[PDB]
Enzyme design. Structure first.
Site, short mmCIF file in Angstrom:
data_model
loop_
_atom_site.label_atom_id
_atom_site.label_comp_id
_atom_site.label_asym_id
_atom_site.label_seq_id
_atom_site.Cartn_x
_atom_site.Cartn_y
_atom_site.Cartn_z
NE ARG A 167 -9.53 8.81 10.09
CZ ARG A 167 -8.98 7.74 9.52
NH1 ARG A 167 -8.24 6.91 10.24
NH2 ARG A 167 -9.16 7.50 8.23
CG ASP A 188 -10.17 2.23 6.51
OD1 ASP A 188 -9.98 1.68 7.61
OD2 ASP A 188 -11.17 1.99 5.80
CG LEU A 205 -10.80 1.86 2.38
CD1 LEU A 205 -9.31 1.95 2.69
CD2 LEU A 205 -11.40 0.61 2.99
CG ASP A 206 -9.24 7.30 5.06
OD1 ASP A 206 -9.63 6.12 5.21
OD2 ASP A 206 -9.19 8.11 6.00
CB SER A 207 -4.02 5.84 2.10
OG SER A 207 -2.83 5.11 2.32
#
Ligand SMILES: CCCCCCCC/C=C\CCCCCCCC(=O)OC[C@H](COP(=O)(O)OCCN)OC(=O)CCCCCCC/C=C\CCCCCCCC
Ligand SMILES: NC(=O)C1=CN([C@@H]2O[C@H](COP(=O)(O)OP(=O)(O)OC[C@H]3O[C@@H](n4cnc5c(N)ncnc54)[C@H](OP(=O)(O)O)[C@@H]3O)[C@@H](O)[C@H]2O)C=CC1
Ligand SMILES: CCCCCCCCCCCCCC(=O)SCCNC(=O)CCNC(=O)[C@@H](O)C(C)(C)COP(=O)(O)O
Ligand code: SF4
Lengths: 318, 85, 174, 97, 51, 156, 51, 112, 337, 114
Positions: free
Chosen positions: H48, B43, B39-41
């Site tokens: 995002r 997240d 998962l992306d940071s």
């Protein structure tokens, strides 16, 4: 055939508020040097009906945010009472001989502004709420002094019935007797009707047409119309109440011929006030009243309570 | 209630199971939340802010600099709840 | 006859049906307006005109306005109409059925069994001769308040005065 | 007693039951109380008009006064309670009914 | 002037700009009508402010 | 007594009505505000033509757009235009907002006034002399007078 | 003799019960123009007015 | 040499994460108050994405300067400054599609 | 002309589209997507200039060109075609006006349009007809439109023909209509449930699809038909309508004849009746599910689901109590298919 | 009767004007056109709480004067009573208290109006 008498009371007055509008732009025009409406007339005369047609023809939106019931019921009440206050008015012969119709004039006048409160409440807008609220402030603030000074000028006619108020003015006029109260009555009629220096309900530049804004076509025409109903009506009221006239019963018409003068002579003056003074602002509007008008209204009131005893001049009516 | 540590863990992983980047297969308590999970940071920040949205207290981001393992954050939740049992 | 005074009493009572149900104070203010004008009309029918116009003036021309101020201080977003809740609207219907049962009892023409007996028939019947000289009973009747009843004037004066003092000693505290 | 009086009395009973069913922000209660006041007024005045018991023509107005007077007081308290909350009856500090 | 026939930069002082800046200090706590009058005593013209 | 005859009469009545006392509201944004005022100045007096500046669109119809428009300003303009009652109009004014005019090439102007609202008559000028404006609005009346929804509605 | 449901409730304050005072947060905020006649067609004086 | 805010990277990255928290949590309020009919998720995703737009900046001071320019926008949406138009502006929804494929572009216009 | 520059408000394009009767819901959107292209248009008015006025911004100075015309005079239609590269037919009417008898509107006008499209050597002609235009005893519109469909096909065979599967938008005469059925009280269902079923397409999708159809070389004589991705039940549909309009929901079961007694009752009004027996037959007949005809996706456009877009469409019907609310709160309606 | 008749004709008149006001222009209402006015830009929030002590601090005083004038009204009729010296004090008396009440407000700075 009493009904046709009533109809005969209601049509001519509406015609009168229309032409009142036109006169307003006229005189108020010539104070400004500029001519008033003119081109459509020939003397402008045809204008107000063109105006009203422009309104009623125009779409009157039902606002999305507004509750609808109050929003509709308010104008109705405005014209309603604006007309209903006319009934017991001796010209010379009242359409109704109320035993105490003056007090009734106060009743109608006092339910009048409540419509303003709804008018600004259901309108939902910020300007609507703020303007409506300050409006109700100035109004009530003036109805108290209003009703007191009216009382004090009524101790001496005798009684609350209106026709007698003719009889008590078969010579000198009330005004010479108690003009200062006539001043305060005048100004209180100049504020209760929400007019020139006491301008706040409309707000105008202060609050972009005040409470009245969200109303569009027809209802706006109703508040506008009813407003002028109250102006001419308090004017007529002052006229009969502070300015008496000769009255031969055999020729009543003569009296009326005089009366419309004496009242019109007042209404024009409001317009000639409108062309003259900047508005008060909500502080001072209430300042001059509670601080300054009122105490004189009281001192004058005890004084007028006290004259009939000292002068042994107590008015007849039982 | 006394708030047992099991309630804390159950809720942590509950919120992390409700969340999208963490596939149920990706889930593993002891495993380091970044070192294993793909998962992306951002997240971290999103799920931590959600979990603390459940426990209700703001996580100072020095504790976002904690992480290491999700379980250590659970330990911090015990540290705030002061139940530690 | 017209029973007009009585039907006015009926509109009065439903005025309290929509009023006593409690759907934002503003609409209740409407409820007291309707019940107010109906009230002054009803008391006007016996000819105590001065009083009916007191209430039509002093009450409705005074009170419900100041309530038209409290709501500015209270309101809260999305005030409820009568239709806006099951208990409120349920309450309004709850009043209507009862008062309607009373009118049905009026159709029965029998004396009311509720609480204590209501003798029935038209309102006019109780009237008596109103014979008098050039003065209404009411006029001198209230005029008596000053000359012939100074005591009440004293206590009312004192009361209202110190009521103003109380308003001071509440609002100033903040 | 003529039916009209019964009707006004019933308007009183509703003007009470409404006060006591008592719900949400209390401003409604000051309304319901004033309605109660009005019903007592009217019920009095019809009587004094009935028997020509003339002195008592003074009472209803005097009644009205004090009654209105207390209500005039009541709003002030509401202000204070409105001052700390934005009013609702649902919030009361005191304990033990 | 850069020396060319096209001036390089031409910052334009607008007296109104400073005034309107000073307004909020001048107008705290005053009644809402009075702030309207006081905008007017500032005699400002926004075309000059926005330059 | 043909129905079309009566329709011609009512057509004349309402279109003459609306054209006889239209009530402008005004975005006197820039410097063509002042020339607008000289229309209302005594020497030309817009009021004698019945037109009267009344604020708040809901009580007004035709809209003057005096003076240069800008980017931040535009959305408010679209708002105000939307809140007007039918039969709303507008009037672009000056070289101002006919199409940016002098300021045609800057990041903050929105070229024409046309690109946010459906303009009626144009009144070119910079500033237009107030009198040329007056000819403008009279021309507007000579355009309302050619309106005929009633004749057309019956026809359809 | 408290019930546990009552036991959860705190003992009464020794004076003013001050904490609730933190709760009042009443405010209003509102905008003049551009349309507004006093706003000279091109001002947006947003302001957090009281009463 | 005077730094704007944080010394070295990472110290500034935490700032930006804080900023994401603020934006993210604020967004549903934005959709509510503004009556935006964007899918409530979409704004979040788009946030995002905007956060991915500069997800390669590496200078010292430039990133903190980036969160300066990042504050003002939430600063505006929270104050109801900007509007439905102004905040809906980010989604470029009225634009005609523009594929980046060479040949696709090639048929359409003279191109760079 | 050869198109130039980036597509844009200033951009030229060869299209000199002629749209008829654009005063309505379609194709105000279609003109707009032309306008973002900057493509010229010649929308001609039958009605009055005033209603047309808002069409003006859509263009760029010289682009949009209103022209006076009549559908009845032959040369009058020769006017607006006279330089058009393509001519498009969007004309339709639900309630039969007197002077325009219900048949010619779907027959003569498309006819003169087709053959004049021949004589002027018009590069493309295009025309609309409801999916249920396939002949059926109920409703004269499906049939008359079938007649003009077959006619233009007989006259301008290479024309592609629209068959839209009910478009939903803010300016819709449909969704707003059943939204407004609340005003009478209940909602007249002939027998509730599965008595009839419908599928909808976003208006935006239909517009994008039409201009894409001019963008498609392949869209020649093919008869395109447009259907939304989802499938719904009229009962659950209206249930979702008042689920988003928040208005009280009263199903109103009804013997079939009486509803037509109602339509006959409401055709009486001189103006524009809320309902008509023709519309009464628009009600209860379900759309056919045939997909094999060339259609929306064949254009490459994918339909926008109605479920996210009804909210904006109906918020104006909302009472103030509920006027602000997220669409997601309402719950996505179940799909029958 | 008399008065009820004029009330009915007036109210029916007005209601007639309302109905001819709505069911006449016969044109297109739609959203955003129907959105509340707010001098252009959309409202920051629906109308809430313009709270002020300075409202009731005086308005209540209105109410307690209006109750007083309610007692002043009997005066014209009371003036003709057989025994004025019994009356006259009171006729003055209330007015004094009215003034007195005001006076008390005048200088406890309770009358800040606005
Ligand atoms: C929104 C809808 C708007 C509708 C607006 C309607 C507002 C009307 C309210 C006005 C009510 C006041 C009526 C009082 C009339 C009055 O006082 O008459 C004076 C007159 C004085 O007579 P005396 O001189 O004393 O005796 C010998 C004279 N020959 O009294 C009478 O004699 C007549 C008595 C007849 C009683 C009639 C009373 C009518 C009351 C109707 C109230 C209905 C309220 C309903 C309002 C609904 C609004 C939602
Ligand atoms: N959901 C839908 O609405 C669907 C529609 N369709 C079809 O597609 C077409 C587009 O629909 P839509 O635009 O909503 O319908 P509209 O009524 O909105 O559009 C028709 C326009 O054409 C004008 N018009 C047509 N013929 C004449 C004539 N002889 N004289 C004067 N004016 C005429 C109409 O009146 P004027 O221009 O004079 O004001 C109107 O402006 C319709 O024909 C319809 O059958 C198909 C599927 C779904
Ligand atoms: C609803 C729609 C309207 C609002 C839409 C979103 C609004 C957001 C506005 C944009 C403001 C910014 O993006 S400011 C700069 C953001 N910072 C970056 O992009 C930094 C990129 N560098 C990175 O290393 C990134 O990958 C990360 C994510 C910061 C890495 O995190 P680290 O592990 O701490
Ligand atoms: S017209 Fe002349 S004055 Fe009006 S804006 Fe354009 S340039 Fe400035």
């Amino acid at each position: 055939m009493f009904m046709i008498n009533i109809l005969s009371l209601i049509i001519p007055i509406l015609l009168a508020v229309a032409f009142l509008t036109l006169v307003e732009r006229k005189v108020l025009g010539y104070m400004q040097l500029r001519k008033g409406p003119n081109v459509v007339g020939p003397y402008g005369l045809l204008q107000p009906i063109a105006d009203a047609l422009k309104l009623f023809t125009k779409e009157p939106l039902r606002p999305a945010t507004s509750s609808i019931s109050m929003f509709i019921i308010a104008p109705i009440l405005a014209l309603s009472l604006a007309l209903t206050m006319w009934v017991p008015l001796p010209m010379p012969y009242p359409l109704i001989n109320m035993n105490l119709g003056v007090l009734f004039m106060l009743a109608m006048s006092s339910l009048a502004v409540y419509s303003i409160l709804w008018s600004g409440w259901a309108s939902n807008s910020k300007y609507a709420l703020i303007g409506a609220l300050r409006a109700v402030a100035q109004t009530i603030s003036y109805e108290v002094t209003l009703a007191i000074i009216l009382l004090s000028v009524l101790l001496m006619n005798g009684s609350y019935t209106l026709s007698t108020l003719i009889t008590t003015q078969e010579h000198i006029w009330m005004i010479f007797t108690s003009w200062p109260l006539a001043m305060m009555w005048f100004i209180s009629t100049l504020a209760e009707t929400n007019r020139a220096p006491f301008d706040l309900t409309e707000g105008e530049s202060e609050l972009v047409s005040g409470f009245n804004v969200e109303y569009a076509a027809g209802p706006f025409a109703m508040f506008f119309m009813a407003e002028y109903a109250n102006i001419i009506m308090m004017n007529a009221f002052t006229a009969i109440l502070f300015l008496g006239a000769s009255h031969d019963p055999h020729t009543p018409e003569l009296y009326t011929i005089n009366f419309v003068l004496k009242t019109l002579a007042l209404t024009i003056t409001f317009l000639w006030i409108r062309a003259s003074y900047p508005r008060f602002r909500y502080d001072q509007l209430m300042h001059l009243l509670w601080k300054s008008f009122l105490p004189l209204t009281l001192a004058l009131c005890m004084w007028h309570i006290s004259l009939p005893i000292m002068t042994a001049s107590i008015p007849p009516q039982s | 209630p006394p708030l047992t540590l099991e309630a804390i863990k159950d809720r942590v992983l509950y919120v992390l199971k409700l969340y999208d980047k963490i596939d149920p297969e990706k889930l593993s308590v002891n495993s380091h939340f970044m070192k294993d999970l793909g998962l992306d940071s951002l997240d971290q920040v999103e799920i931590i802010m959600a979990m603390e949205d459940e426990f209700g207290f703001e996580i100072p981001d020095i504790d976002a600099e904690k992480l290491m393992c999700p379980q250590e954050i659970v330990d911090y939740i015990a540290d705030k709840k002061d139940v530690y049992e | 006859t017209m029973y007009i005074a009585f039907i006015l009493s009926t509109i009065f009572v439903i005025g309290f049906v929509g009023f006593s149900s409690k759907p934002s104070p503003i609409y209740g203010g409407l409820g007291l307006i309707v019940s107010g004008g109906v009230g002054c009309g009803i008391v006007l029918n016996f000819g105590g005109s001065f009083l009916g116009l007191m209430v039509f003036l002093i009450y409705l021309g005074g009170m419900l306005v100041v309530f038209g101020y409290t709501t500015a201080m209270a309101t809260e977003m999305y005030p409820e109409v009568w239709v806006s809740n099951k208990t409120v609207f349920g309450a309004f219907v709850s009043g209507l059925m009862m008062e309607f049962c009373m009118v049905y009892y009026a159709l029965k023409e029998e004396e009311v069994e509720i609480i204590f007996k209501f003798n029935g028939l038209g309102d006019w019947v109780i009237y008596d001769t109103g014979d008098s000289g050039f003065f209404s009973e009411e006029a001198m009747g209230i005029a008596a308040l000053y000359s012939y009843g100074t005591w009440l004037v004293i206590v009312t004066g004192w009361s209202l005065l110190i009521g103003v003092v109380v308003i001071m000693e509440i609002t100033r505290g903040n | 007693m003529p039916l009209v009086y019964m009707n006004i009395i019933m308007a009183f009973a509703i003007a009470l039951a409404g006060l006591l069913m008592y719900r949400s922000h209390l401003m409604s209660s000051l309304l319901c109380l004033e309605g109660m006041m009005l019903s007592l007024f009217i019920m009095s005045t019809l009587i004094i008009l009935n028997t020509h018991f003339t002195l008592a023509n003074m009472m209803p107005i005097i009644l009205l006064v004090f009654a209105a007077c207390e209500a005039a007081l009541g709003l002030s308290l509401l202000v204070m309670v409105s001052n700390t909350y934005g009013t609702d009856y649902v919030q009361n500090l005191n304990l033990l009914q | 002037s850069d020396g060319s026939s096209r001036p390089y930069r031409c910052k334009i002082k607008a007296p109104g700009f400073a005034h309107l800046a000073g307004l909020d200090k001048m107008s705290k706590g005053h009644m809402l009508a009075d702030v309207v009058a006081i905008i007017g005593t500032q005699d400002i013209v926004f075309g000059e402010v926005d330059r | 007594s043909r129905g079309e005859y009566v329709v011609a009469k009512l057509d004349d009545l309402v279109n003459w009505a609306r054209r006889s006392s239209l009530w402008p509201m005004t975005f006197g944004l820039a410097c063509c505000a002042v020339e607008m005022m000289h229309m209302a100045a005594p020497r030309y007096d817009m009021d004698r033509f019945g037109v009267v500046f009344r604020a708040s669109p809901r009580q007004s119809d035709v809209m003057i757009v005096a003076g240069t428009l800008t980017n931040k300003m535009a959305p408010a303009l679209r708002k105000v235009y939307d809140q007007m009652p039918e039969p709303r109009y507008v009037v672009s004014m000056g070289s101002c907002a006919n199409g940016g005019g002098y300021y045609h090439y800057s990041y903050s102007v929105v070229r024409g006034c046309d690109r946010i609202v459906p303009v009626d008559i144009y009144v070119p000028g910079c500033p237009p002399t107030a009198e040329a404006l007056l000819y403008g609005i009279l021309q507007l009346q000579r355009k309302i007078k050619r309106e005929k929804r009633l004749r057309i509605w019956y026809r359809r | 003799y408290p019930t546990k449901e009552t036991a959860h409730w705190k003992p009464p304050p020794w004076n003013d019960v001050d904490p609730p005072k933190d709760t009042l947060v009443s405010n209003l905020t509102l905008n003049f123009g551009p349309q507004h006649p006093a706003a000279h067609g091109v001002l947006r004086l947003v302001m957090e007015l009281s009463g | 040499v005077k730094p704007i805010f944080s010394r070295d990277m990472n110290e500034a990255k935490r700032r930006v994460r804080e900023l994401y928290r603020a934006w993210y949590r604020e967004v549903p309020n934005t959709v509510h108050l503004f009556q935006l009919d964007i899918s409530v998720k979409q704004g979040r995703d788009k946030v995002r994405e905007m956060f991915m737009k500069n997800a390669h900046v590496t200078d010292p001071r430039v990133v903190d300067l980036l969160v300066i320019k990042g504050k003002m926008e939430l600063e505006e949406t929270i104050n109801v400054w900007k509007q439905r138009t102004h905040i809906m502006r980010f989604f470029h929804e009225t634009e005609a599609p523009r594929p980046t494929d060479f040949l696709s572009k090639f048929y359409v216009g003279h191109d760079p | 002309l050869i198109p130039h520059g980036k597509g844009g408000r200033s951009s030229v394009s060869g299209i000199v589209a002629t749209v008829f009767g654009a005063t309505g819901f379609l194709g105000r959107y279609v003109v707009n997507h032309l306008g973002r292209m900057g493509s010229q248009v010649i929308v001609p008015y039958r009605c009055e200039p005033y209603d047309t006025m808002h069409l003006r911004p859509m263009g760029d100075l010289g682009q949009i060109i209103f022209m006076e015309w009549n559908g009845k005079d032959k040369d009058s239609i020769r006017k607006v075609v006279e330089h058009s590269n393509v001519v498009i037919n969007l004309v339709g009417r639900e309630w039969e006006t007197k002077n325009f008898d219900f048949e010619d509107v779907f027959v003569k006008i498309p006819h003169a349009i087709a053959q004049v499209s021949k004589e002027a050597g018009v590069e493309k002609l295009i025309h609309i007809s409801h999916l249920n235009a396939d002949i059926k005893s109920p409703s004269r519109y499906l049939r008359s439109k079938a007649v003009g469909e077959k006619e233009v096909r007989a006259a301008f065979p290479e024309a592609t023909i629209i068959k839209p599967s009910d478009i939903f938008g803010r300016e819709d005469r449909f969704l707003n209509y059943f939204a407004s059925m609340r005003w009478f009280g209940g909602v007249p269902l002939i027998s509730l449930g599965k008595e009839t079923v419908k599928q909808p397409v976003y208006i935006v999708d239909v517009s994008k699809g039409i201009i894409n159809a001019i963008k498609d070389p392949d869209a020649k004589g093919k008869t395109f038909a447009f259907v939304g991705p989802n499938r719904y039940l009229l009962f659950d549909l209206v249930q979702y309508i008042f689920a988003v309009a928040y208005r009280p929901f009263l199903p109103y079961p009804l013997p079939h004849f009486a509803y037509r007694w109602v339509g006959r009752l409401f055709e009486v009004s001189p103006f524009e009746p809320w309902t008509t027996r023709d519309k009464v037959e628009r009600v209860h007949m379900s759309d056919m599910t045939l997909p094999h005809l060339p259609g929306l996706e064949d254009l490459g456009i994918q339909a926008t689901p109605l479920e996210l877009k009804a909210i904006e469409v109906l918020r104006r019907h909302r009472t103030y109590r509920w006027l602000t609310s997220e669409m997601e709160d309402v719950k996505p309606a179940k799909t029958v298919n | 009767m008399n008065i009820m008749l004029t009330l009915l004709t007036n109210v029916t008149l007005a209601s007639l004007l309302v109905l001819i006001a709505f069911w006449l222009p016969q044109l297109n209402a739609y959203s955003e056109k129907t959105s509340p006015y707010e001098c252009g830009f959309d409202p920051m929030g629906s109308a809430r709480l313009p709270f002020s002590m300075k409202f009731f601090l005086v308005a209540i005083t209105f109410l307690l004067f209006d109750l007083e004038i309610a007692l002043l009204l009997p005066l014209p009729w009371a003036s003709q009573t057989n025994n004025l010296k019994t009356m006259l004090t009171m006729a003055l008396f209330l007015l004094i208290l009215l003034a007195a009440s005001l006076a008390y407000e005048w200088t406890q700075k309770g009358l800040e109006w606005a």
